[PDB]
């Protein structure tokens, strides 16, 4: 939990790294 | 009626409804029960002096076999009593 | 009871789910779903009550040998993966009373408002008794439905626990 | 010697020191979850120092470090049996536990009783290690129950869930049944023989040991979930995934076979045990896969996927392969437990979704998860040089090239291909195809801790199984000579399972309606053994109790 | 530093306790510890009596 | 365990091979072994001597009680507590000693099985065969008695056994 | 502090007596009927359906959704054994007899086939793993005093 | 699972956006409080399909009894907000 | 043995002369104290027992039961005071006095050197129990179960009186020490077959024996927690004591007369275990559960094997500690919901964390978890049956299973479940309640550390 | 953790005793 | 085709195949309504205590007590010379007991003679 370093999407490819 | 014990005494141990008396009844249970018997009694039973001569038999048993091993005697005689003194009948 | 008209729906939605798990693939699911809805629309305009009554026996006698060997079930719903998994952590509200003083000293503010929450749980209780005695048929109340409060400042009777019922996730 | 023995006993006592810190003191809260893990980390190192000495010296040490009890002509002690199995099975269990150790430190962040969670995870580990190291049936019996009880709580962690309460007792019911043979075995070795110390049992070499071994056969019937007492093993998947990863995948399930191996000198001569055990695995090893071909639960499927591996292990013993079967224990545990953890990754990103049909499009949306899923499967399916293949090729040697029942070899290969069949059905939905999870995307696994957990348990299957083979010293005459097809029959039928399932999998894409089939339901509904034997039998015992 | 505590507190002390208890309270007893006699190989010497292991017979000299 | 004699506890010698390393890498075990002498053994021995020294200044002993033989049940009379009691306790104590001899012998078997290991079968002819001798005598003397063992019963069993073989022996001639 | 008349009692042999019992447990006279009069002696208790709790809808907000039992409702004489934990009689997925007989097939099929294979097992066409020294008579501890029958497995 | 938070404002379009892909509705005429039967000129059978989409959208079953009455988007929001106890 | 009798008596003035508010404490303090001196009785000897005088003596077998009884009086008081707080001052002294006498008879019972004296005290021991069960009973349903105790005297005590008298005239004495040396071979006759029934039927009912157990389920359903504890912890154990001693003179007749008794248990064990799964009461479930364990002892005594006696001693001990704790544990809920129904309250682990820890703790050893003494004895006996008969393992295995099935069920039904919504008086566990359970579980495990103290006399 | 604050009160059994 | 499931004690019928419920007439409408109102009145009667702050205790359910009360059936029902169940019922409780009488007895009688002739193995048997 570093401040939501991943922002989830809706019907989308993941916001990976 | 099943009255509560946490109302009049917000910290009743559960021994009585007098806040002063309850404390002592708590202390007695936790001293003679735990601090004495379950502590000292548990300790005391630990060092009992050769209960039922359990330890003594091992030491005596070991000595006997030495004599029988060296002299070649049977490890344990096959008859409990001397055949001579079983005075037979008829 | 519940009438056969609504009984139509109880197979409309349920039959899809077993079909849904059978379909698996998305393009298959919609297409096959259209196949099923098309069959429904074969008789959806049928307004014959005798036939509409008789156009449901086979459907139930038809679905039994089509039911999923391992039908899918939603997680939180009964029989699911998260079926009451967290009920072991949910804690009753009424136990707040037995909290030890020192323990209560950590949250002085929250407990202050509760006294008012319970306040209207007590004062409003009396009129809540009468509030049902005008909507109270003789021979025992016909149903378990409840009315709202027809005034200002009170609340619909028989409300305390649901409003104070714990939250979904204790942790 | 002194160093070898002394440093060996530290692990069992060392692991218990954190436990002694839970019942006492309140010095440092919030840090115990890491405390335990480091102890295993430290324990592993002290579990590898014996590894070096044992291989070099092969010093099987039986240490009697107490005089507990004494009856007429009996003596019980808290002894340990430092030998091949303990020195070679302990390191793997800690290695897996070490991986699972850090896996659980993340998954169970949603549990306020996480500290309680570890209060029992470390408990089970202690009992299991004591079990394997036990030199006597009694002390061995203790572990036989500790795994039984420690499972009870861990199985039923969420005591609210009716599935946990019913499943937990279902296993306990079965687990207790197995002990009937165990207690019987002690009686026979106490009546005909006179002690429960393996030294006297093996040396006397019983001439008619059918009865004692028959109890051993039953012992593994329920504890290891063999057929006839199998159903509970899948039932464990109603609770935490990490709990299932260790207990019912790597550590507890291995108990049933272990006892037979530990009594290898006696089991050899009596073929009556071998046949039924050989057949017992035969019925189970396929009944598990035969059922598993169409099951549709990610966690349960893995359980069945584990069941067949366990079911075959009995066949491996059934073919009189004492030390070769032992390898299958360690080799299977690595990936399968990782698969549980990998199934954890899927469930994590899925936000509590487990239906195999609600998964897909994870090759790139779940890159790290996809990474280790194939290795375990390929290793599970018997990919050459991988951890699972060594046993799979080796084990099939003697069974197909030594005196064995005609029907025993029949299901031996039929299910062997089925082993890969469900793996493809799994990796298909798991990884192949476009995503099918609910609309919102909760997918995120950029969690360093789990990567450490996956890192540690990803490596072992690839390399550790290979390494384990080299050091272990000779104990058998390997059957390196045999017909090429028999030596390669696994190398022949292995690819069939992937293709045959691939033939089954891809034809279902076409937009053609489906058709019910009885066998499609007989295997899917678990052969109706649980669906039936878990209704009437409770009804018989209970409905008839009042009269 | 947090890893320095474990080295002596949780590991070194128990082995002293275990070994100390092992050294006098266990080893001083008969058959409390019985270790399998060490293996014997060709081309080996024994410290005690300066023993000798007769070398095996010359092998039939296979391709090697 | 101050000083246990070895005659009662036979122990074939340990012949640890002298290593003959031939690899071109250092032995790893050596690094730890030397630490054992300095970091484990001596500290295990350094505190001990500090403990030992005081016990040398403060001394006190204990004995091993010796029960003189007393007349056996054959020397006792029917319904005579005095004589019968002296034999019963003697019979009880002696029999209780005979209980261990099975355990002491059992302990020898636990030695010929693990130290020898894979040479169990050919290296325990004396121990395994000597195991039977103890079983024969002990079993005959004090088995099939029941819970309430008593010198009268055991004498009766010995009277039972002696008479049994009496007829058979004369049967041969 | 409960009335005598509102407790389980004898078997009611006339409808007039049966009126109370049905009313007693809040069961309408139609749904009520006790066990046959016999030595079984189960009293004026009703004869509720032989069904488990899971069958009842959970979606209703019961007083005790855990048991799916509402306050004031009667309880099956063995409702304790029919609880969610214990025996479940919910609708089954496959035909009863066939389900039982589906188990019968596979299990009965395998047992005999083993005995069929027992008479004719599978193996390899090779001779014994020959051993020296009187077939390991002495290695197996064979008595040195009485030598075994000489054994020499010749070359070929 | 870190945190799957839920917000009423964020959920607002989740229920409504489900309607934004319907092929039987004009998106602009639709309103937050519009009754489906009358304002949207829909039917119960049509209404069944909308209710189903919420279960694939959010992932939690819906009772048959209460599914019908959810003829208003606010009510559907109330069902989702109230069942999960989301208030902000 | 006087050093424990008089101080036991001295509690009576202490129970009476004491101040108003120190009545509980004073007896509790010394009662706990006396037990400490009780430990001195563990000075056994390998070949001979301990013979103080002609009136009392304690061998190896006697002492462990003695310690339990003395150790159990203070625990009985602890639970008692909650329900007695409302009672008037004078009666509490009355009830407390009976326990002191009840302990007095018990301690003198097991230490009695003469059988008739044991017979006398045996009858006396019942009298305090009946008052305690009846005077302060938990029910008013007038079961009219007197016939069972009338049956006890008719089929039990009264025949025993005649046989004891007959033996003295014939043998010439009833001092167990004399019996050791003047025991005669009891040949087979119809008279002896009648004499045999006189020496054993008296003790069988108290164990109890399957079929003859009808009083026990209804005895606990009414006896208060104070009365219940001694009944299952001590009173049930009286029969085994005499049966072990008395069987010294019934051989060889017991070699065939035991079968109808053995079959009653061998099958009785399973029957009781199954019904518990059907029981609808925390106490009643324990009642039959009590019959279960006691059934195992009966088999051990009759076969009279050296292992049977060793295992039997612990079974009485562990069960006494077990059931006694279970009643207290079960009666902990009674202190809140004032009911014996097991389904009225559920999911109590949600509100009584440390209470559930005892529940899990006690239940674990109830089903003979290893290595606890609950299993050492129970596992000791199972092996002995094998030499007597190999088939017996079937029933022991089944009994252990079902005993493992219901034991966890009771725990499952109450703690592992969902809380009762309407219940609103689940107060936190009191110090007294938790303390009481702790005194039970702890020593129960400790004896597992040292088994040589409850191994019986054969060790 | 994942988000600052967002702290929700916990109803618990009274653990003092 | 679709052979209708044979109703069994352990398999309740599916809800949408019982012919009773397809048609809901007064003969069913009347009964359905009466139970709900009766059930409602119980809820209403129970609803007061549940949502009344005054109560501090456990509701004394009248249904539970009778269910528990009926279990403890001791002598009140049943007749001694009722041949239907007394003879057969008594068998379930005395029948199998005699069966064990011969089972163990036969072996012990069998076993004893072998020992008297040495036809059984005990050479390494002590614990008895
Ligand atoms: C009813 C009558 C009971 C039978 C009593 C009897 O017949 O005893 C006869 C016998 C008299 O003979 P006596 O002179 O004393 O000594 C020589 C013995 N050969 O008397 C004796 O020698 C011994 C008498 C011992 C006391 C007998 C106790 C009477 C009760 C015996 C039956 C007990 C049944 C218990 C209930 C079982 C229920 C299943
Ligand atoms: C003696 C020491 C207390 C130090 C202090 O004053 O805080 C005790 C109390 C807290 C303990 C520590 C905590 O349990 C956790 C520490 C950090 C890691 O978990 C490893 C063990 C760890 C290093 C422990 C070592 C030792 O047992 C500690 C350090």
What count of other Cβ atoms lies within 10 Å of the Cβ of residue I3?
13
I155 lines ligand 1 (CB under 6 A): yes
The DSSP 8-state label assigned to residue D70 in this structure reads E
Q: How many CA atoms lie within 13 A of K37 on its CB side?
A: 14
CB-CB contact of I204 with I261 (8 Å): yes
The rounded Å distance from CA H58 to ligand 1 centre is 85
CB-CB contact of I174 with I167 (8 Å): yes
Active site residue H43: yes
The rounded Å distance from CA I57 to ligand 1 centre is 30
In sequence order, the β-bridge partners of residue G28 are none
What count of other Cβ atoms lies within 10 Å of the Cβ of residue H60?
17
Residues D258, D262: Cα–Cα separation, whole Å? 6
In chain C, which residues have their Cβ closer than 8 Å to the Cβ of D346? none
Q: For residue B39, what are its two tokens?
A: 């502590």
Q: Does H2 touch chain J (CB under 8 A)?
A: yes
**Burial (Cβ within 10 Å: 0-12, 13-18, ≥19) of residue I45:** middle
Quote the minimal CA–CA distance from G144 to chain F in Å. 10
Residues F142, D418: Cα–Cα separation, whole Å? 61
Rounded to 5°, the CA angle C107-C108-C112 comes to: 120
Checking phi first, is residue E34 left (phi over 0); if not, alpha (psi -120 to 50) or beta? beta
D24 lines ligand 2 (CB under 6 A): no
In chain G, which residues have their Cβ closer than 8 Å to the Cβ of F125? 141
Q: Which residue of J has its CA nearest to H6?
A: J6
User: CB–CB of K125 and I267 under 8 A?
Assistant: no
Task: Provide CB contacts within 8 A for B18, sequence distance 6+.
Answer: I21
Quote the minimal CA–CA distance from D66 to chain F in Å. 13
Q: Does H1 touch chain D (CB under 8 A)?
A: yes
Quote the minimal CA–CA distance from E53 to chain F in Å. 10
Mark D37-51 as b/e (b = at least 16 C-beta within 10 Å): bbbbbbbbebbebbe
What Å distances lie between residue I432 and F72, I79, I283, I332, I335, CA to CA?
Answer: 58, 8, 21, 10, 12
In sequence order, the β-bridge partners of residue I57 are I51
**Alpha-helical regions (H) of chain G:** 15-24, 96-119, 133-136
In chain K, which residues have their Cβ closer than 8 Å to the Cβ of C155? none
Chains that touch I (3 or more CB pairs under 8 A): B, C, D, F, G, J, K
Residues in chain K after which the chain is broken, C→N over 2.5 Å: none
Full DSSP string of I172-218? S--BHHHHHHH-------HHHHHHHHHHHHHHHHHS--TTS-THHHH
What count of other Cβ atoms lies within 10 Å of the Cβ of residue G138?
15
Residues I234, I227: Cα–Cα separation, whole Å? 11
Mark I224-240 as b/e (b = at least 16 C-beta within 10 Å): bbbbbbbbbbbbbbbbb
CB-CB contact of D382 with D389 (8 Å): yes
CB-CB contact of I151 with I252 (8 Å): no
Query: Among D16, D27, D37, D43, which residue has the most ligand 2 atoms within 8 Å of its CB, making it the best to mutate?
Result: D27
Ligand 2 atom nearest the C-alpha of D38 is: 20
Q: For residue I260, what are its two tokens?
A: 């109808």
User: CB–CB of D60 and F117 under 8 A?
Assistant: yes
Which among I83, I73, I71, I93 has a CA at the least distance from the CA of I21?
I93
Residues D3, D46: Cα–Cα separation, whole Å? 11
Ligand of minimum distance to the alpha carbon of I260: 1
Q: How many CA atoms lie within 13 A of G136 on its CB side?
A: 6
E9 lines ligand 2 (CB under 6 A): yes
D35 lines ligand 2 (CB under 6 A): yes
State phi, psi for D544 to the nearest 5 degrees: -90, -5
The DSSP 8-state label assigned to residue A10 in this structure reads B
Which among I384, I277, A13, D443 has a CA at the least distance from the CA of F146?
I384
Q: Which of I215, I266, I424 to mutate to test the interface with K (most CBs of K within 10 A)?
A: I424
Type and span of the H or E element at I423: none
What Å distances lie between residue I414 and D117, I80, I126, I229, CA to CA?
Answer: 21, 24, 34, 22
In chain C, which residues have their Cβ closer than 8 Å to the Cβ of K58? none
Residues K78, K66: Cα–Cα separation, whole Å? 19
Q: Map tokens 């399909």 to a residue.
A: H49
The DSSP 8-state label assigned to residue F144 in this structure reads S
Q: Map tokens 């010698």 to a residue.
A: F13
I165 lines ligand 1 (CB under 6 A): no
SS3 labels along J1-17: CCCCCCCCCCCCCCCCC
CA dihedral D289, D290, D294, D297 (to 10 degrees): -40
In chain G, what's the furthest Cα-to-Cα distance?
102
CB-CB contact of I293 with I430 (8 Å): no
Q: Does E47 touch chain F (CB under 8 A)?
A: yes
Tell me which residue has its CA closest to atom 11 in ligand 2.
D28
Q: Which of K3, K6, K16 to mutate to test the interface with C (most CBs of C within 10 A)?
A: K16
Please report the resolution in angstroms: 3.8
Tell me which residue has its CA closest to atom 2 in ligand 1.
I194
Quote the minimal CA–CA distance from D262 to chain F in Å. 15
Chains that touch J (3 or more CB pairs under 8 A): A, C, H, I
User: CB–CB of D62 and E14 under 8 A?
Assistant: no
- Break chain H down into helix, strand, coil percent, rounded to 5: 50, 0, 50
What Å distances lie between residue D531 and G71, G89, G92, G95, K10, CA to CA?
Answer: 32, 11, 8, 12, 11
**Alpha-helical regions (H) of B1-89:** 19-28, 42-46, 54-71
**Alpha-helical regions (H) of D192-297:** 198-204, 210-223, 232-235, 241-246, 255-262, 264-267, 271-292
Tell me which residue has its CA closest to atom 16 in ligand 2.
D35
Which among F134, D520, K106, D92 has a CA at the least distance from the CA of I390?
K106
CB-CB contact of D382 with D388 (8 Å): yes
Ligand of minimum distance to the alpha carbon of I158: 1
Full DSSP string of K78-123? --TT-TTTHHHHHHHHHHHHHHHHHHHHHHHHHHHHHHHHT-S--T
Tell me which residue has its CA closest to atom 21 in ligand 2.
D35
Which among I248, I297, I245, I246 has a CA at the least distance from the CA of I268?
I297
Instruction: Please tell me which residue in H13, H43, H66, H82 is annotated as part of the active site.
Output: H43
CB-CB contact of D353 with D437 (8 Å): yes
Q: Map tokens 């169940």 to a residue.
A: K85
CB-CB contact of D388 with D380 (8 Å): yes
CB-CB contact of D466 with D460 (8 Å): no
The DSSP 8-state label assigned to residue F36 in this structure reads I
In chain J, which residues have their Cβ closer than 8 Å to the Cβ of H5? 3, 6
- Out of A8, A11, A14, the one facing D365 most closely (by C-beta) is A14
Q: For residue G44, what are its two tokens?
A: 């004026």
Mark H6-22 as b/e (b = at least 16 C-beta within 10 Å): beeeebeebbbebbeeb
Rounded to 5°, the CA angle G148-G152-G155 comes to: 165
Task: Provide CB contacts within 8 A for B47, sequence distance 6+.
Answer: none
Which among D173, D170, D145 has a CA at the least distance from the CA of D252?
D145
Query: Among I166, I167, I204, which residue has the most ligand 1 atoms within 8 Å of its CB, making it the best to mutate?
Result: I166
CB-CB contact of D117 with D108 (8 Å): yes
Residues I217, D490: Cα–Cα separation, whole Å? 64
- Out of D365, D440, D444, the one facing A13 most closely (by C-beta) is D365
In chain D, which residues have their Cβ closer than 8 Å to the Cβ of K122? 192
User: CB–CB of I263 and K49 under 8 A?
Assistant: no
């Amino acid at each position: 939990g570093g401040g939501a370093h991943i922002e989830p999407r809706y019907r989308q490819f993941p916001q990976l790294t | 009626e099943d009255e509560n014990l946490y109302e009049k005494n917000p910290d009743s141990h559960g021994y009585d409804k007098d806040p002063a008396v309850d404390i002592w009844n708590m202390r007695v249970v936790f001293f003679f029960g735990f601090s004495i018997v379950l502590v000292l009694g548990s300790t005391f039973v630990a060092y009992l002096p050769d209960y039922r001569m359990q330890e003594w038999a091992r030491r005596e048993a070991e000595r006997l076999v030495k004599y029988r091993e060296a002299h070649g005697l049977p490890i344990m005689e096959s008859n409990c009593f001397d055949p001579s003194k079983i005075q037979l009948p008829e | 009871y519940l009438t056969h008209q609504q009984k139509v729906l109880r197979l409309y939605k349920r039959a899809l789910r077993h079909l849904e798990s059978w379909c698996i693939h998305r393009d298959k699911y919609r297409y096959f779903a259209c196949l099923l809805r098309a069959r429904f629309d074969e008789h959806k305009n049928e307004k014959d009550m005798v036939k509409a009554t008789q156009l449901l026996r086979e459907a139930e006698e038809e679905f039994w040998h089509g039911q999923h060997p391992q039908p899918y079930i939603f997680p939180e719903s009964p029989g699911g993966t998260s079926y009451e998994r967290y009920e072991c952590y949910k804690v009753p509200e009424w136990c707040l009373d037995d909290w030890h003083p020192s323990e209560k000293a950590m949250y002085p503010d929250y407990f202050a408002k509760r006294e008012q929450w319970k306040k209207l749980r007590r004062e409003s209780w009396e009129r809540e008794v009468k509030q049902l005695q005008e909507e109270t048929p003789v021979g025992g109340p016909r149903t378990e439905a409840l009315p709202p409060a027809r005034k200002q400042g009170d609340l619909p009777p028989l409300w305390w626990h649901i409003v104070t019922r714990p939250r979904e996730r204790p942790m | 010697m002194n160093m070898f023995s002394s440093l060996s006993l530290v692990t069992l006592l060392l692991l218990t020191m954190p436990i002694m810190m839970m019942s006492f003191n309140t010095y440092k809260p919030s840090n115990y979850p890491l405390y335990v893990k480091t102890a295993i980390s430290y324990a592993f190192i002290t579990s590898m120092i014996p590894t070096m000495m044992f291989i070099h010296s092969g010093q099987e040490l039986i240490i009697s470090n107490w005089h507990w009890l004494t009856i007429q002509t009996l003596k019980l002690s808290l002894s340990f049996k430092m030998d091949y199995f303990s020195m070679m099975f302990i390191p793997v269990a800690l290695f897996v536990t070490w991986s699972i150790m850090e896996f659980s430190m993340w998954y169970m962040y949603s549990d306020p009783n996480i500290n309680k969670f570890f209060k029992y995870l470390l408990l089970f580990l202690i009992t299991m290690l004591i079990l394997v190291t036990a030199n006597n049936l009694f002390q061995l019996f203790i572990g036989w129950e500790g795994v039984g009880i420690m499972s009870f709580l861990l199985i039923g962690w969420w005591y609210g869930r009716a599935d946990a309460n019913t499943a937990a007792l279902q296993a306990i019911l079965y687990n207790r049944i197995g002990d009937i043979g165990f207690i019987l075995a002690m009686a026979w070795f106490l009546t005909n023989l006179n002690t429960w110390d393996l030294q006297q049992i093996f040396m006397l070499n019983p001439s008619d040991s059918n009865m004692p071994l028959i109890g051993l056969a039953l012992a593994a019937t329920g504890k290891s979930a063999q057929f006839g007492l199998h159903p509970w093993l899948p039932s464990a998947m109603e609770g935490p995934t990490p709990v299932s990863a260790l207990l019912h995948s790597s550590t507890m399930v291995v108990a049933g076979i272990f006892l037979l191996i530990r009594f290898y000198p006696l089991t050899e001569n009596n073929k009556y045990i071998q046949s039924i055990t050989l057949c017992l695995g035969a019925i189970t090893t396929l009944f598990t896969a035969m059922c598993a071909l169409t099951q549709n639960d990610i966690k349960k499927i893995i359980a069945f996927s584990t069941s067949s591996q366990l079911g075959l292990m009995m066949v491996t013993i059934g073919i009189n392969q004492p030390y070769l079967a032992f390898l299958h224990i360690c080799t299977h545990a690595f990936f399968k437990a990782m698969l549980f953890m990998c199934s954890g990754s899927i469930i994590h990103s899925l936000n509590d979704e487990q239906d195999i049909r609600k998964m897909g499009g994870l090759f790139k949306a779940m890159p790290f998860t996809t990474t280790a899923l194939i290795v375990g499967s390929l290793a599970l399916t018997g990919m050459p040089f991988l951890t699972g293949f060594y046993s799979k090729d080796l084990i099939i040697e003697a069974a197909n090239t030594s005196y064995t029942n005609a029907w025993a070899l029949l299901m031996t290969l039929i299910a062997t291909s089925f082993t890969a069949i469900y793996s493809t059905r799994i990796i298909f939905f798991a990884l192949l195809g476009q995503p099918r999870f609910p609309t919102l995307v909760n997918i995120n696994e950029n969690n360093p801790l789990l990567i450490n957990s996956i890192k540690r348990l990803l490596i072992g299957s690839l390399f550790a199984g290979y390494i384990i083979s080299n050091n272990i010293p000779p104990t058998t005459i390997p059957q390196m000579t045999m017909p090429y097809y028999l030596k390669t029959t696994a190398l022949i039928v292995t690819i069939l399972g992937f293709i045959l399932a691939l033939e089954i999998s891809n034809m279902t894409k076409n937009l053609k309606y489906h058709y019910p089939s009885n066998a499609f339901k007989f295997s899917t509904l678990l052969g109706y053994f649980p669906t039936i034997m878990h209704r009437l039998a409770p009804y018989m015992n209970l409905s008839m109790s009042q009269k | 530093y947090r890893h320095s505590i474990f080295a002596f507190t949780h590991v070194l002390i128990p082995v002293w306790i275990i070994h100390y208890y092992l050294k006098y309270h266990v080893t001083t007893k008969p058959y409390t510890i019985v270790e399998k006699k060490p293996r014997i190989f060709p081309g080996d010497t024994i410290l005690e009596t300066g023993e000798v292991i007769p070398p095996m017979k010359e092998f039939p000299d296979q391709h090697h | 365990p101050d000083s246990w004699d070895k005659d009662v506890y036979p122990e074939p010698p340990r012949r640890t091979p002298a290593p003959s390393p031939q690899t071109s890498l250092p032995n790893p075990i050596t690094y730890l072994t030397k630490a054992f002498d300095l970091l484990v053994d001596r500290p295990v021995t350094l505190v001990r001597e500090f403990i030992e020294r005081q016990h040398a200044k403060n001394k006190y002993y204990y004995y091993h009680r010796e029960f003189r033989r007393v007349p056996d049940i054959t020397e006792c009379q029917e319904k005579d507590v005095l004589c019968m009691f002296e034999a019963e306790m003697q019979w009880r104590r002696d029999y209780k000693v005979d209980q261990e001899i099975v355990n002491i012998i059992q302990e020898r078997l636990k030695a010929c099985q693990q130290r020898e290991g894979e040479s169990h079968r050919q290296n325990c002819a004396k121990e395994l065969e000597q195991f039977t001798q103890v079983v024969k005598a002990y079993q005959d003397r004090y088995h099939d008695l029941g819970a309430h063992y008593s010198a009268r019963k055991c004498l009766a069993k010995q009277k039972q056994r002696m008479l049994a073989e009496r007829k058979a022996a004369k049967e041969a001639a | 502090h409960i009335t005598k008349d509102m407790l389980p009692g004898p078997y009611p042999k006339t409808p007039e007596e049966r009126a109370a019992a049905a009313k007693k447990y809040n069961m309408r006279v139609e749904d009520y009927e006790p066990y046959p009069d016999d030595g079984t002696g189960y009293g004026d208790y009703p004869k509720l359906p032989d069904r488990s709790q899971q069958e009842r809808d959970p979606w209703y907000d019961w007083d005790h959704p855990d048991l799916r039992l509402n306050w004031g409702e009667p309880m099956h004489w063995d409702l304790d054994m029919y609880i969610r934990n214990r025996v479940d009689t919910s609708p089954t997925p496959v035909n009863w007899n066939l389900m039982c007989k589906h188990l019968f097939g596979f299990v009965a099929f395998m047992l005999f086939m083993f005995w069929v294979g027992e008479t004719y097992p599978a193996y390899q066409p090779v001779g014994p793993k020959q051993y020296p020294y009187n077939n390991l008579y002495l290695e197996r501890g064979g008595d040195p005093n009485k030598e075994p029958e000489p054994v020499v497995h010749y070359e070929i | 699972s870190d945190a799957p938070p839920l917000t009423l404002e964020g959920i607002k379009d989740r229920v409504l956006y489900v309607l934004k892909l319907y092929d039987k509705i004009d998106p602009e005429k639709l309103s937050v409080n519009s009754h489906f039967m009358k304002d949207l000129g829909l039917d119960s059978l049509d209404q069944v399909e909308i209710i189903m989409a919420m279960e694939d959208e959010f992932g939690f079953e819906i009772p048959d009894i209460d599914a019908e009455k959810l003829m208003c988007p606010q009510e559907i929001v109330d069902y989702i907000a109230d069942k999960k106890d989301v208030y902000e | 043995m006087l050093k424990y009798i008089i101080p036991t008596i001295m509690l009576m003035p202490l129970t009476w002369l004491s101040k108003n508010n120190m009545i509980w404490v004073n007896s509790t303090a010394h009662s706990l104290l006396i037990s400490f001196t009780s430990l001195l009785l563990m000075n056994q000897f390998g070949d001979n027992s301990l013979n103080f005088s002609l009136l009392f003596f304690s061998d190896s077998l006697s002492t462990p039961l003695l310690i339990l009884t003395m150790w159990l009086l203070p625990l009985m008081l602890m639970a008692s005071q909650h329900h007695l707080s409302k009672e008037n001052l004078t009666r509490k002294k009355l009830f407390i006095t009976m326990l002191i006498s009840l302990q007095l008879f018990l301690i003198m019972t097991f230490t009695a050197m003469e059988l008739i004296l044991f017979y006398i005290l045996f009858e006396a021991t019942l009298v305090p129990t009946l008052i305690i069960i009846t005077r302060w009973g938990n029910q008013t349903e007038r079961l009219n179960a007197g016939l069972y105790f009338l049956f006890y005297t008719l089929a039990g005590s009264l025949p025993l009186l005649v046989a004891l008298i007959y033996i003295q005239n014939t043998v010439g004495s009833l001092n167990f020490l004399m019996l050791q040396y003047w025991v005669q071979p009891v040949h087979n006759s119809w008279s002896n077959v009648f004499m045999w029934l006189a020496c054993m039927m008296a003790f069988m009912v108290k164990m109890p024996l399957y079929g003859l157990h009808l009083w026990l389920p209804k005895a606990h359903v009414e006896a208060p927690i104070a009365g219940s504890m001694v009944l299952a912890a001590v009173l049930l154990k009286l029969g085994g004591y005499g049966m072990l001693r008395i069987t010294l003179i019934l051989n060889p007749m017991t070699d065939f007369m035991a079968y109808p008794f053995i079959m009653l248990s061998l099958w009785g064990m399973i029957m009781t275990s199954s019904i518990c799964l059907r029981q609808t009461d925390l106490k009643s479930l324990i009642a039959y559960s009590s019959v279960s364990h006691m059934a195992l002892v009966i088999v051990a005594i009759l076969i009279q094997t050296p292992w049977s006696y060793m295992g039997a001693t612990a079974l009485m001990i562990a069960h006494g500690l077990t059931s006694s704790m279970l009643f207290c544990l079960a009666n902990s809920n009674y202190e809140r919901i004032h009911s014996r129904t097991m389904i009225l309250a559920r999911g109590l682990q949600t509100l009584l964390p440390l209470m559930a820890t005892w529940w899990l703790l006690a239940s674990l050893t109830n089903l003979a978890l290893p290595p606890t003494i609950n299993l050492i004895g129970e596992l000791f006996v199972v092996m002995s049956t094998f030499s007597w008969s190999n088939i017996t393992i079937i029933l022991m295995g089944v009994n252990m299973v079902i005993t493992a099935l219901y034991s966890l069920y009771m725990l499952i039904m109450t703690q592992r479940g969902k809380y009762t919504y309407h219940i609103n008086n689940i107060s936190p566990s009191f110090t007294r309640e938790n303390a009481l359970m702790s005194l039970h579980i702890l020593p129960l495990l400790l004896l597992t550390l040292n088994p040589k103290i409850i191994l019986g006399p054969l060790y | 953790s994942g988000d600052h604050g967002k702290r929700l009160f916990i109803i618990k059994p009274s653990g003092f005793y | 085709s679709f052979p209708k499931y044979e109703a069994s004690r352990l398999s309740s019928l599916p809800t949408t195949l019982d012919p009773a419920e397809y048609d809901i007439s007064s003969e069913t409408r009347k009964a359905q309504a009466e139970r709900l109102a009766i059930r409602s009145r119980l809820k209403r009667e129970y609803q007061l205590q549940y949502y009344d702050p005054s109560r501090r205790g456990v509701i004394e359910d009248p249904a539970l007590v009778r269910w528990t009360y009926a279990r403890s059936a001791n002598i009140y029902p049943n007749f001694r010379p009722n041949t239907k169940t007394s003879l057969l019922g008594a068998l379930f409780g005395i029948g199998p007991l005699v069966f064990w009488y011969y089972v163990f007895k036969t072996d012990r009688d069998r076993k004893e003679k072998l020992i008297q002739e040495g036809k059984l193995d005990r050479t390494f048997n002590i614990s008895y």
